[PDB]
């Protein structure tokens, strides 16, 4: 009975290339992630001569 | 038994669909190209993207009107600005209240000497123009991002149009036109989506691309560099808009024990991060839109070529494995060009490079198409410090899209690699360096196969694992193997026949037998043949007892499909789907009630008999269909007409015969070794009538 | 934003092999009997595993990439290919009896 | 019955809240259970 | 009949209704664990004696 888990490990055992099919296309297509600034002033100094 | 092959398939098929999903995902765009002059193709589109201010784009017709293109930067408020408008100066009013995405204007002579305008308001942050010509029309983007619709005009001469750009472009056919808006509305797509990867001279017909296994082990040093595109924006040279990290190429030699090999490598970078410097809304101040640097979640690729004897065996492969060792790159100085007062200098900034993954890649240097090899390299944040002084900003890791050259003209990677090539060998000897008749075949194959292992093998089930195992794979084609034969399997005809059998059954909710049911909807043969082949279904509900016919005909295929050599990968869902319904169209079932055995067979022969002395009994069918439908069922390996010729003509005991009834595999191999004749006759006969 | 920080490593596997044989004494009968009557599966293995982060990859796949290189699955692959041998008419060798 | 475009997510969508409501707590509270009683060591007799 | 055979190198064939002995022959076992079902015999010969 609980012997199946070992005929279950053979029995999806293919999809262990479809965990690469992720991750061999999840690195290519990865998007740009954009970074939120403070909602307050930044620049200080005007240029000075 | 090893009929649950069949089970399976049609059982995880539904997983199909999140590969399809990812397939969608990898379901492409052509470019980008140096600037030049061609004629492209009606039923292509023109996916510009310039990052420079200057006259983007123009067509020229020399008898029809003048179209031209102007780019407008933000931050810029109501002035004149001079650009060259088809070598001929002019100037253009520009009015921006966006601070972020720049704007595109058309510009429209009416003839080639015609008046000048500004219209055509387009406004979008990855700077995407898109231009079509096809059917009598001219297409051009129109309207404000993200949903917007195609500009309509009709002038003479359409497939003479020749349009001279001065940017990178992509040329997409009508089909990808989901793919074009979701690139065009959606952000800069990353650069490893592109076909031609480096900018470099442009080509119109680039091509992605028994036996005995080969191994190479060879050392490689790759010399690799980075590549900056800085871009000033509008005003008096005040603030700039765009410092981003672009494709690079390289090419150099070196040597490997005598050999000046040639490695040619280019680098790209994705998944960058953009730091945003936002200065004083004042239209004077130094002001950067975004600073592209690279951190923990971002990752760089190499494209690595050279001429080898191992680098000629490429094109198949079995194993691939890096084992790089990891190589430090460090920053320099940036100095910025402020006209007044102090510029900005970008000091510090250093990552690492590991590898974490390899796989075949495209690249392209004049008109030669190269099978290269891509490393993925993964990043790690270090050490030294990077800010950018003169400033408020400090306390930041990872390394700028300024000045990664820090002088150098080429970072070293030294590792080995190891790959194993598959090459054709039609003897062993004579074994190359550089790089239907199926269904007769398969059908002839088929009656040499024994009958004891076969049946052997029927008492073994199968399972997802064990129909690969003995095959010989492709690294590159393994990954979608079971993916693309539970694809076509969830298509079969059994698959129709079984969600027909559901459907049926839900409906049956709202004859032959005694009542209403899913099963009981030469006359008298007619009908039992329609029962038998409702019935075949049966064998799929795992309400059988001992061997079925299913796992002959699987145990057939493993057999055949080992055996033999010229099928190729892409050639297994074909074969499976078609054995596994053309396959033994004689089918007999035979249930019992009673002591008394009724039997019926597809062709169209039925009959019914008795356990104790065989005994011909008169056929009801009546009782048939009342008993079928919830009963146990057996395969008929040993229909009556063996069954009766052993009786006869061999001394059985009762407990073989009733076995044999039951289809016991122990009594069945005892006879197969006894080698009667009229079992072997028998198994013959089934065995023959497999074949497409 | 900050340098990223060194993982950490694994219990030593000849550590795990004394620590698992040591742990002998410490189980019933009875009750691994009944446990034993009761079907496992991938859902039902890492109940009391696999604790809820928003960073686990399904550590159930991760043991699938390690299995299909053990011991059993090229016994099976061996077996399977020696069946498949014989019922394709394979004409025995004088050492093969 | 609606028998729609190219292939979805029904069945992966289906199971995220399959795996989440009382059925899978409860197989998960039964294994709980039966791996401490193979456990049950340090107590002696103690499972009522 | 019932053949009993292990890993170590020993083997044994007794009587179903009563527990004693009888001579084993190597042809009817080979033949026995081609076709019909095994079973994992927890209680061993030793311990069932």
């Not at chain 2, 800010?387 to 590792?415: F, S």
């Amino acid at each position: 009975m609980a012997s199946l888990i070992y005929r279950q490990l053979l029995t999806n055992s293919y999809t262990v290339d479809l965990s690469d099919e992720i991750q061999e296309i999840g690195s290519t297509k990865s998007q740009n992630v954009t970074i939120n600034p403070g909602p307050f002033a930044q620049t200080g100094y005007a240029p000075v001569n | 038994m090893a009929s649950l092959i069949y089970r399976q398939l049609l059982t995880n098929s539904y997983t199909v669909d999140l590969s399809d999903e990812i397939q969608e995902i990898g379901s492409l765009l052509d470019g980008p190209y140096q600037p030049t002059t061609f004629n492209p193709p009606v039923d292509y589109w023109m996916l510009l993207a310039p990052t420079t201010p200057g006259v983007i784009v123009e067509g020229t017709n020399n008898t029809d009107r003048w179209l031209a293109t102007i780019l407008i930067e933000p931050n810029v408020q109501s002035e004149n600005r001079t650009y060259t408008i088809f070598g001929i100066q002019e100037q253009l009013t520009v009015s921006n209240t966006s601070q972020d995405q720049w704007k595109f204007i058309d510009v429209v002579k009416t003839t080639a000497n015609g008046s000048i305008g500004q219209y055509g308001p387009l406004l979008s942050s990855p700077k995407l123009y898109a231009v079509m010509k096809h059917n009598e029309k001219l297409y051009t983007y129109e309207g404000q991002t993200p949903n917007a619709t195609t500009a309509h005009y009709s002038t003479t001469n359409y497939d003479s149009v020749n349009m001279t750009a001065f940017c990178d472009f992509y040329i997409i056919p009508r089909s990808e036109e989901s793919k074009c808006t979701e690139y065009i509305n959606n952000g800069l797509p990353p650069i490893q989506n592109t076909r031609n990867v480096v900018p470099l001279s442009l080509t119109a017909r680039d091509v992605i691309h028994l036996w005995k296994e080969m191994q190479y082990n060879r050392d490689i040093t790759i010399r690799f560099k980075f590549a900056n595109t800085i871009i000033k924006s509008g005003g008096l040279g005040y603030k700039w808009s765009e410092i981003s990290f672009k494709p690079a190429n390289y090419q150099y030699t070196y040597t490997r024990d005598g050999e000046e090999v040639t490695a040619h490598t280019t680098c790209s970078v994705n998944g960058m991060n953009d730091f945003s410097f936002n200065g004083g809304y004042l239209p004077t101040d130094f002001v950067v839109s975004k600073f592209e640097v690279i951190k923990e979640n971002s990752y760089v690729y190499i494209d690595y070529w050279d001429d080898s004897q191992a680098f000629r065996n490429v094109v198949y492969v079995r194993s691939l494995a890096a084992n790089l060792n990891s190589v430090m790159c460090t920053g320099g100085s940036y100095n910025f060009s402020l006209p007044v007062g102090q510029w900005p200098v970008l000091t510090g900034g250093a990552v690492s490079l590991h590898s974490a993954g390899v796989t075949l890649s495209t690249q392209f240097t004049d008109f030669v198409s190269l099978n290269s090899l891509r490393f993925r390299f993964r990043l790690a944040v270090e050490e030294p410090h990077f800010k950018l002084t003169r400033t408020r900003l400090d306390r930041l890791y990872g390394l700028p899209a300024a000045d990664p050259n820090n002088g150098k003209e080429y970072y070293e990677i030294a590792g080995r690699f190891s790959l194993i090539s598959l090459v054709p060998s039609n003897d062993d000897y004579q074994t190359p360096i550089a790089n239907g008749e199926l269904r007769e075949e398969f059908n002839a194959l088929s009656q040499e196969i024994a009958m004891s292992q076969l049946i052997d093998l029927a008492l073994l089930p199968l399972d997802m694992f064990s129909m690969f195992s003995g095959i010989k794979s492709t690294i590159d084609a393994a990954k979608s193997m079971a993916t693309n034969v539970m694809k076509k399997f969830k298509k079969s005809g059994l698959a129709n026949s079984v969600s027909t059998l559901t459907d049926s059954l839900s409906d049956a909710a709202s004859s032959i037998g005694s009542s209403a049911s899913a099963w009981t909807d030469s006359s008298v043969s007619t009908q039992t043949s329609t029962i038998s082949r409702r019935l075949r279904l049966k064998e799929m509900a795992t309400q059988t007892e001992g061997m079925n016919f299913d796992d002959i005909s699987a145990a057939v295929l493993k057999t055949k499909i080992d055996k033999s050599t010229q099928i190729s990968p892409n050639t297994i869902p074909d074969i499976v789907t078609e054995a596994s319904e053309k396959f033994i169209p004689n089918r007999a079932y035979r249930v019992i009630n009673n002591d008394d055995v009724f039997e019926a067979g597809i062709d169209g022969k039925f009959f019914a008999y008795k356990v104790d002395t065989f005994e011909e009994i008169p056929f009801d069918v009546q009782k048939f269909a009342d008993l079928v439908t919830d009963s146990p069922v057996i395969s008929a390996i040993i229909d009556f007409k063996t069954l009766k010729n052993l009786n006869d003509n061999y001394g059985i005991s009762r407990q073989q015969a009733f076995n044999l009834l039951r289809s016991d595999p122990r009594v069945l191999r005892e006879f197969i070794n006894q080698d009667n004749p009229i079992i072997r006759n028998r198994i013959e006969q089934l065995i023959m009538q497999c074949r497409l | 934003n900050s340098v990223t920080v060194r993982q950490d490593l694994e219990r030593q596997l000849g550590e795990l092999r004394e620590e698992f044989n040591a742990l002998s004494q410490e189980i019933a009968m009875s009750q691994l009997i009944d446990l034993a009557l009761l079907p496992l599966d991938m859902f039902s293995m890492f109940s009391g595993i696999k604790s809820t982060i928003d960073a686990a990859k399904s550590m159930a796949t991760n043991v699938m990439k390690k299995f299909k290189k053990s011991g059993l699955a090229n016994s099976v692959s061996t077996l399977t290919d020696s069946l498949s041998d014989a019922a394709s008419s394979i004409s025995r060798g004088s050492s093969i009896r």
